[PDB]
């Protein structure tokens, strides 16, 4: 396979052994696909805006005279680009235009005749658009709408395992959760009676709903019970003998038939007698009369002679009642078949408990439960019952909801209605009864097949539907005002509800979270995040224990380790590498179909529900390259459990070893050698690393760095292939190839790299080119490196020479000893950018302005400020310095923006936003003119290319016609067009070319004018503010003691000392190590992947060192080729094959100079290098195989008694800096109510002496100290002043006084009707 | 340091010493073995 241009620069050695069959898909596909489904036009109304419009429209007025219908919708082009939206602070959105038809019928003839049809296009708000990176730009800020893991709509049966009734009995219940509507629950009480609840309200007997459904008692008994006919023969009241009714009963009556005594009295029934009656096919059996008394009649029995009912339905029979029925002449009597364990009489008991006896009574009772206090009316009760579940406007069982409902009820139909029905409720209650009887099982609530995933598109569609129904109600009200003949559809609707709902969803939702821009890994993890804490879901406090557990169905869909450590553990998960979503919202994972033993290559995506049936093999299974498993007993999983299976019983094959883990977990080398907890911590802290000023590739990696870097939009990727026409530190111009040419286009791609722009975490975002002039490029090749990216590979940390040994207790528990060379080389130095805004508003007295001079200040203060009152760009500033000079009239008072205390840096960017109508200052004119110059430069380069082509064509025409090339080459270019040739078709084509040139110039100047007008169009602001000035300050943070640093295996720590270079341990060659780590951490925190990585790193560095030596001696290319080929060929059954014989003898030198700093190693997350491969690589580098060398003390110089582990490890600088945590206060501002010191670091505030600290002081003899904490330092203002004065004069004495908080509490209590006072006596 | 998640027909003598009985009333059976009626 031929490597890409960016890959040939630095090929990473891969130690993977199992060939891959499915490439890693696009990481951000889950968001983009959902948004496309939301916004793309759909001929069928199933998803998105089209589906919402079809659900709402058409709109019918109150009277059948006029109507409004929807035809089509079109999303307009956004007014501002994504970068323009980010800079200006506006929301990236597109206008929504909808085609509406207003139809006015005939007043005289309402049968369907129409009078007027009016078509119009109306705007109904702006829909925010998702960028190419799956993010939203809301109010100029990047936001991510995470997916929500909620409960799928449908019917779910569960129970409590003895949680209630104190007896251990299970109370089964069933819930019908719709997508939009009311919740219906059927529960079993301790007394074995079925009850029904609506919206978790007061329960009612479960037969009330049946009665309200126009069902009589006889119909209910027929539906929910088996019927036995007690036909009255000449005597003995024989029945029909069904042997299945005699299973496991007490045979208190003599069972005889056909002269044979099958069973005698007092004999229990076992399988033998059941076999006997089954083989005898007995149908008529003599029955004692008393056996009738224990049964329950089924249907009402009336007397024909007297016209009166002998017996009603569903009550216990009696001797007198049966005698009266027999003497009445009813030779046929019906009864229920009820068993104590098989067919319980729950329905009959519920009916007996049920007080209602008619449909009207049941409806009235339902209305009374639903709306207490209101007068129950027949019409009101009927309307409420109809609208509860049988109306599309109130109840909506979604397509996935209907599918789950039918699957739970074992139905072959999937395309059902969105509303409930009598059959659905009857089947649900029958299933619950069967489950109670014993036939059936409860559903797993935490099962991933019972949980749905909602993405941004679904929630946006739901919010748009809410806004649409609000607008529909408004337009329904408006449409019935008459005089429709003179009104367009434009004024019928109002865009306020839709726009308000959209803004609330996209800006004020629990799932529209601030984008985490620490590094590309942070953004990737945030975008592929599933949170169960959204609206209509779980809560952080009442989550419980079971839901947070790792279900077996999480295999291949949810990362078992990537989860937050804290209150929301298990509630927030990360999508797996290969996991994707069904059309119904259920997660599915890929597998390889295994047919007749051999493993095929076709990929089937299996869901959680359907994966239980098949037996799925394992990725870590050895294959003989023929598709057959080398071992007969393969470890597989059948139904949520692991077991050994035969090689012919396997059904599916794992597609990869990274399928289980997510991207953050798969980025950790040697993960299988680390504890699960340590892997979790490493994955969590891998995305907290700030980017350094120099990206350093990981010496040991997993091969997923390229995918993470490319998929994240932090790097510039060539859209079309070609050659680098013009490379620069800020822009790249690529001349595209003729194959990818577009008609009527010059064919140049311009990439404007973002340089030093602050992120959401106040970090630095910078792009650096990695191409040169004339270098060919292809589609998908990287052109610039984003933050924490090196040559298209993710680079979160730096390679560090570490040594595992105790060093005088400076790495006691988890601390890190750092050499001074680390600070000298600025390896971990980072750049942080902070934005400060100065706001010039409109006041009642007058408008404040930004001006150069400031009252009552010296001249040196305004030295940094220009004549416009804004600090100079590039001017170094410190705490308290004036940034933007602003004054407010009272003559004026100081309101100028100042640098916060303890904040320094350099001003690198100033942005001025001016409201329309307000004059623009000199700085704003300068900024707009730089932007105009940049746009003009781009359009001008385009013009030069196009006009060069046109003039080449003109010269060719001239040389073909007049062959005056010698004269043409000595003339100004315009004269070529001005000159006229002889009168033929040549003159006509010359005139046509001149006209084309003129029209092209006109089009380009029109484009320039449009760009200039867009640049200075003028952005609006909040009501009351007329100007905004934002200043960006960039500062450099260097590594220092107290800063948090960690590896990829959860080995976090804090820098304890910056040791001098001469004091650090050194080897025989005299090279000191960079990091000293405590070995004591390894045995407890079981993360061996550290040491292995370290060893591997050493080997990698050794190889690089050798290459560097081969480069320092100016050796011939043949030796370098041979050595690099030998290094790449090292391994045992490695899938990667590198052939250096096809490198043209020049790319070899570039590869060698790239590898001279260390050959990168790719270690797959579960198919990595073994110890033998690492030892062989170390032997190739002429390093000890044990990985331990002999070190010497820097101070004393004596050799250490034992060899120590010295290698190279990837270190990460987490975003926990000591200068952001250190804080101290002696006396500052206080709260204006409680008179207590403020809280936080941004505002000068003191630490909180909480209740627990007070308890600790009380446990001591600390009495004066406690009084000092409570009164003289926090509340007592007079005490505070007296203590300050006494310390100033040198007296350490206190006056406790009276805390103000107690006075405030006393006043608050006295504000009620309660008197409280401090009595003196 | 605690936990929250919710997860004989004969008497064996291991040491050497006398045996004492407390709040016991018993009776000698047919075989002479003592059976306690407490």
């Amino acid at each position: 396979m031929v490597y890409s241009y960016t890959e040939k620069k630095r090929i990473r050695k891969d130690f993977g052994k199992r060939p891959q069959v499915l490439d890693v898909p696009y990481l951000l596909s889950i968001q983009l696909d959902s948004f496309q489904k939301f916004i793309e036009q759909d001929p069928e109304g199933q998803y998105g805006l089209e589906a919402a419009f079809r659900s709402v429209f058409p709109i019918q007025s109150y009277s059948g005279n006029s109507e409004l219908q929807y035809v089509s919708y079109r999303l307009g082009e956004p007014v501002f680009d994504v970068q323009e939206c980010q800079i200006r602070g506006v929301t990236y959105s597109a206008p929504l235009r909808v085609k509406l038809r207003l139809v006015i019928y005939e007043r005289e003839a309402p049968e369907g005749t129409v009078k007027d049809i009016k078509e119009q296009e109306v705007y109904m708000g702006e829909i925010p658009l998702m960028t190419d990176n799956g993010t939203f730009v809301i109010n100029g800020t990047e936001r991510v709408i995470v997916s929500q893991l909620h409960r799928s709509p449908g019917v779910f049966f569960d129970s409590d395992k003895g949680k209630t009734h104190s007896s251990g009995k299970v109370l089964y219940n069933a819930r019908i959760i719709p997508y939009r509507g009311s919740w219906l629950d059927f529960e079993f009480d301790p007394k074995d009676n079925l009850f029904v609840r609506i919206d978790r309200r007061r329960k009612l007997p479960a037969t009330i709903i049946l009665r309200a459904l126009n069902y009589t008692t006889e119909q209910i008994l027929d539906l929910f019970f088996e019927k036995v006919i007690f036909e009255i023969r000449d005597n003995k009241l024989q029945m029909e003998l069904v042997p299945e009714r005699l299973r496991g009963e007490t045979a208190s009556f003599d069972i005889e038939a056909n002269g044979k005594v099958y069973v005698e009295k007092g004999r229990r029934i076992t399988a033998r007698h059941i076999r006997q009656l089954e083989k005898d096919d007995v149908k008529l059996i003599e029955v004692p009369v008393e056996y009738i008394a224990g049964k329950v009649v089924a249907k009402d029995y009336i007397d024909e002679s007297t016209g009166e009912l002998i017996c009603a339905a569903n009550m216990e029979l009696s001797l007198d009642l049966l005698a009266k029925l027999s003497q009445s002449g009813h030779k046929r009597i019906e009864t229920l078949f009820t068993n104590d364990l098989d067919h319980g009489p729950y329905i009959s008991e519920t009916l007996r408990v049920d007080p209602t006896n008619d449909r009207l009574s049941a409806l009235v009772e339902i209305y009374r439960m639903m709306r207490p206090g209101e007068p129950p009316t027949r019409e009101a009760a009927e309307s409420l019952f109809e609208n509860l579940f049988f109306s599309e406007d109130r109840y909506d069982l979604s397509a996935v909801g209907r599918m789950k409902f039918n699957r739970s009820l074992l139905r072959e139909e999937i395309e059902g209605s969105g509303i409930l029905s009598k059959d659905d409720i009857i089947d649900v209650m029958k299933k619950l009864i069967d489950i109670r009887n014993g036939k059936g099982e409860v559903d797993d609530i935490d099962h991933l097949g019972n949980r749905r995933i909602r993405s941004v598109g679904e929630m946006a569609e739901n919010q748009f539907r809410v806004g649409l129904v609000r607008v529909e109600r408004a337009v329904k009200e408006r449409l019935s005002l008459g005089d429709l003949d003179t009104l367009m559809p434009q004024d019928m609707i109002n865009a306020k509800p839709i726009s308000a709902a959209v803004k609330e969803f996209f800006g004020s939702s629990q799932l529209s979270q601030f984008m985490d821009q620490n590094n590309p890994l942070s953004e990737i993890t945030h975008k592929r995040r599933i949170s169960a804490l959204g609206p209509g879901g779980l809560t952080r406090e009442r989550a419980g224990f079971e839901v947070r557990d790792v279900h077996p169905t999480h295999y291949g869909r949810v990362c078992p380790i990537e989860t937050p450590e804290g209150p929301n553990i298990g509630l927030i998960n990360s999508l797996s590498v290969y996991a994707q979503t069904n059309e119904y919202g259920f997660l599915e994972t890929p597998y390889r179909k295994v047919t007749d033993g051999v493993v095929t290559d076709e990929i089937h995506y299996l869901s959680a529900i359907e994966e239980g049936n098949y037996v799925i093999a394992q990725a870590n299974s050895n294959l003989d390259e023929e598709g057959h498993f080398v071992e007969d007993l393969v470890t597989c999983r059948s139904k949520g459990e692991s077991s050994l299976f035969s090689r012919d019983q396997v059904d599916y094959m794992d597609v990869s070893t990274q399928q289980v883990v997510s991207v953050g977990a798969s980025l950790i080398p040697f993960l299988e050698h680390d504890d699960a907890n340590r892997a979790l911590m490493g994955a969590n802290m891998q995305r907290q690393a700030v980017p350094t000023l120099r990206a350093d590739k990981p010496l040991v990696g997993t091969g997923m760095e390229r995918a993470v870097a490319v998929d994240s939009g932090v790097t510039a990727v060539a859209k079309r292939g070609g050659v680098v026409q013009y490379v620069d530190a800020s822009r790249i111009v690529i001349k595209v190839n003729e194959d990818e040419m577009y008609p009527g286009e010059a064919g140049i791609d311009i990439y404007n790299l973002t340089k030093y722009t602050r992120s959401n975490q106040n970090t630095c975002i910078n792009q650096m080119p990695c191409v040169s002039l004339g270098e060919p490029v292809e589609r998908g090749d990287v052109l610039a490196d984003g933050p924490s990216t090196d040559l298209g590979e993710l680079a979160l940390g730096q390679n560090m020479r570490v040594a595992f040994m105790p060093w005088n207790g400076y790495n006691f528990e988890d601390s890190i000893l750092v050499s001074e060379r680390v600070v000298q080389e600025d390896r971990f130095t980072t750049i942080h950018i902070q934005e400060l805004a100065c706001v010039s508003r409109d006041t009642k007295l007058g408008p404040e302005e930004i001006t150069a001079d400031i009252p009552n200040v010296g001249e040196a203060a305004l030295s940094k400020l220009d004549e416009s009152g804004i600090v100079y760009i590039g001017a170094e500033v410190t705490g308290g310095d004036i940034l933007v000079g602003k004054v407010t009239p009272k003559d004026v008072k100081d309101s100028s923006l100042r640098v916060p205390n303890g904040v320094s840096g350099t001003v690198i960017d100033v942005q001025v936003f001016t409201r329309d109508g307000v004059e623009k200052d000199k700085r704003a004119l300068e900024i707009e003119e730089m932007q105009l110059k940049q746009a003009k430069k781009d359009l001008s380069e385009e013009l030069q290319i196009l006009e060069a082509g046109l003039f080449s064509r003109i010269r060719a025409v001239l040389v073909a016609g007049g062959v005056e090339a010698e004269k043409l080459d000595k003339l100004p270019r315009d004269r070529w067009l001005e000159l006229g040739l002889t009168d033929e078709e040549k003159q006509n084509q010359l005139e046509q070319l001149a006209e084309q040139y003129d029209e092209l110039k006109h089009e380009f100047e029109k484009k320039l004018e449009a760009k200039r007008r867009k640049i200075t169009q003028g952005d609006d602001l909040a009501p009351g503010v007329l100007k905004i000035v934002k200043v960006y300050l960039a500062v450099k943070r260097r590594i220092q003691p107290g800063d948090k640093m960690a590896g990829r295996h959860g080995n976090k720590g804090v820098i304890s000392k910056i040791n001098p270079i001469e004091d650090m341990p050194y080897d025989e060659n005299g090279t000191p190590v960079d990091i000293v780590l405590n070995p004591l951490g390894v045995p407890s925190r079981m993360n061996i992947g550290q040491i292995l990585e370290t060893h591997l790193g050493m080997a990698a560095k050794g190889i690089g060192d050798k290459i560097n030596a081969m480069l320092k001696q100016q050796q011939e290319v043949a030796k370098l080729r041979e050595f690099i080929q030998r290094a790449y060929d090292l391994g045992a059954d490695v899938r990667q094959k590198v052939d250096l014989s096809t490198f043209s003898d020049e790319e070899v030198m570039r590869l060698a100079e790239n590898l001279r700093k260390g050959m990168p190693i790719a270690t797959p997350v579960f198919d990595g290098a073994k110890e033998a491969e690492i030892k062989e690589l170390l032997k190739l580098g002429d390093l000890p195989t044990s990985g331990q060398i002999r070190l010497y003390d820097g101070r004393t110089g004596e050799q250490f008694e034992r060899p120590v582990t010295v290698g190279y490890m990837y270190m990460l600088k987490l975003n926990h800096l000591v200068d952001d945590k250190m804080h101290a206060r002696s006396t500052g501002s206080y709260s204006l109510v409680t008179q207590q010191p403020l809280g936080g670091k941004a505002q000068f505030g003191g630490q909180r002496f909480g209740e627990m600290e007070v308890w600790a002081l009380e446990a001591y003899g600390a009495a004066y100290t406690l009084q000092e904490m409570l009164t003289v330092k926090s509340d007592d203002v007079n005490g505070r002043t007296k203590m300050y004065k006494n310390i100033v004069d040198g007296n350490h004495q206190m006056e406790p006084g009276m805390p103000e908080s107690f006075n405030v509490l006393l006043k608050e209590i006295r504000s009620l009707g309660i008197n409280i006072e401090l009595e003196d006596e | 340091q605690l936990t929250m998640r919710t997860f004989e027909s004969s008497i064996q003598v291991k040491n050497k010493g006398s045996i004492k009985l407390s709040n016991v009333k018993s009776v000698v059976n047919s075989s002479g073995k003592l059976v306690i009626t407490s």
Partner: protein, 537 residues
């Protein structure tokens, strides 16, 4: 009063919410409407409705949402009533009376100070300067370098040279209270003597970390400055770290070596059989130290040295006894920090964690408190120094895996196959066969752990002068496990032997255990199974 319900300005032309003001306004509106209705001689229905609405408004002001639906403000949430500002965690009692924010306090991350004494803690210079500002002002005015206190601040914030001297003078004997965020017990806050350091991190003595339950991986501590004579006296006499030696919960000592001191003392107090300088006779511990520093004798050499030990008699003084003892060079060197009253039997052993704790307990019981503090500091210093000198390291070859473990695993597979075949025959039910499988897997894991431990503990077979000899191994993992510095039998067994049975979240035990070590490569199934227990914990 209005000041308790202020209408703060928003610096944009508008004001705050002030739900109390809104409720008062509603009550006033209802009262005024009712008064106007009464003055108009209203019919019964209208006055009844107005009175009911006024009563509801009064109830909402007194206790919003107590009876009916709570009044919703501009934020789509219930307004804060009078009762809401008294009760609850956010109420006045638990937020401004039982606990409150205090001046003269700061917060910063912690860092190990190995050079610090037991009563000392390292404080950043900037933090100390900010905290002790009034004291610096007072000292500057007393010594007369400034005329006004404004000049005092003007010398302070500019950081003149004399300001550091003043700050050093004012913190010479001024204790500071260090407290961790979870103050679970009494020892969560302790008094220390400040030592000015360069940086932004507070330096903490290692020996007090166990009292604080603090580790150096991002933890933060808060420092408070007592500013009265009484408070300084109780900080020095009650809250000082030297005073707290025994846990009030059970009386057990709280200051024990944990990680590196134990390892250093264990390495120093160990013996080989053929170390350099073995068998010589030394005049005392000083000669042993000189020989070790000169490289002539190894730290583990078994020699005979003359030592003098002091014993306490009935009258209370110390009587000396000089004798020749067979010991090691390291033990003789360590004897120089032991106080006089203690005997020599404490150091003439391997000196593990329990041995060090027992030696400290004996020193406390016999000598007192101050000698115990000095001994603890010297023990920590020596342990750190000799742990650094030892150069102990963890490597991939340290976790040796025995092949007998593989043979035992294969035999366990054979036994489980036999059990499965018996189950297929129908002679054993599912429950009993599962129990037998669990039992045999537990037995196999125990055998693997036993074989691995036997290999690890006595792997070192070294040659004496004439022939071979099997002694205690010097494997770094084994030394760490045996000395008690870090790790236990279970963790080392997981590292080198099989991980054993694992339990699925419902509580049951899976039939197939994790037969792969952490050194070896766990497959996807084993990692997925272990994630269940990890997530549960």
């Amino acid at each position: 009063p209005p000041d308790l319900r202020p209408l703060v300005p928003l610096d944009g032309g508008r004001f705050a919410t002030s739900d109390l003001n809104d409720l008062y306004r509603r009550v006033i509106n209802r009262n005024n409407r009712l008064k106007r209705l009464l003055d108009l001689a209203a019919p019964d229905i209208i006055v009844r409705n107005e009175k009911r609405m006024l009563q509801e408004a009064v109830d909402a002001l007194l206790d919003n949402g107590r009876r009916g639906r709570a009044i919703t403000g501009s934020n789509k949430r219930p307004l804060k009533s009078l009762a809401d500002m008294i009760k609850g965690k956010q109420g006045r009692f638990r937020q401004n009376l039982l606990g409150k924010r205090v001046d003269y306090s700061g917060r910063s991350v912690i860092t190990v100070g190995p050079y610090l004494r037991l009563h000392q803690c390292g404080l950043p210079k900037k933090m100390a300067l900010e905290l002790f500002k009034p004291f610096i002002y007072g000292k500057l005015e007393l010594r007369g370098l400034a005329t006004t206190i404004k000049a005092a601040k003007k010398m302070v914030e500019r950081e003149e040279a004399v300001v550091w001297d003043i700050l050093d003078e004012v913190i010479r004997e001024h204790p500071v209270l260090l407290n961790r965020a979870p103050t679970l017990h009494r020892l969560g806050i302790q008094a220390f003597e400040p030592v000015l350091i360069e940086g932004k991190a507070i330096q903490l003595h290692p020996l007090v970390c166990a009292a604080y339950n603090a580790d150096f991986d991002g933890d933060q501590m808060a420092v408070h400055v007592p500013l009265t004579l009484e408070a300084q006296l109780e900080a020095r006499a009650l809250m000082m770290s030297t005073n707290n030696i025994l846990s009030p919960a059970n009386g057990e000592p709280i200051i024990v070596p944990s990680q590196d001191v134990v390892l250093g003392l264990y390495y120093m107090t160990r013996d080989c059989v053929n170390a350099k300088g073995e068998g010589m006779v030394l005049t005392g511990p000083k000669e042993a130290e000189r020989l070790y520093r000169s490289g002539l004798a190894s730290l583990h050499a078994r020699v005979k040295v003359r030592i003098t030990e002091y014993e306490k008699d009935a009258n209370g003084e110390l009587v000396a006894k000089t004798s020749l003892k067979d010991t090691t060079v390291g033990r003789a060197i360590l004897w120089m920090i032991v106080p006089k009253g203690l005997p020599y039997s404490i150091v003439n052993q391997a000196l593990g964690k329990k041995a060090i704790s027992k030696m400290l307990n004996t020193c406390y019981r016999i000598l007192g408190l101050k000698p115990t503090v000095i001994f603890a500091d010297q023990i920590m210093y020596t342990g750190f120094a000799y742990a650094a000198r030892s150069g102990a390291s963890v490597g991939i070859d340290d976790m040796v895996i025995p092949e007998k473990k593989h043979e035992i695993i294969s035999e366990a597979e054979a036994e489980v196959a036999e059990i499965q075949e018996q189950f297929q025959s129908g002679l054993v039910t599912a429950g009993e066969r599962y129990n037998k499988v669990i039992d045999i897997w537990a037995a196999a894991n125990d055998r693997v752990s036993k074989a691995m431990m036997d290999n690890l503990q006595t792997e070192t077979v070294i040659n004496r002068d004439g022939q071979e000899e099997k002694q205690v191994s010097f494997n770094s993992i084994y030394m760490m496990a045996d000395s008690g510095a870090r790790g236990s039998a279970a963790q080392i067994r997981q590292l080198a032997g099989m991980r054993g049975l694992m339990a699925k979240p419902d509580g049951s035990i899976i039939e197939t255990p994790i037969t792969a070590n952490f050194r070896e490569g766990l497959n996807v199934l084993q990692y997925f199974i272990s994630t269940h227990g990890a997530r549960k914990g």
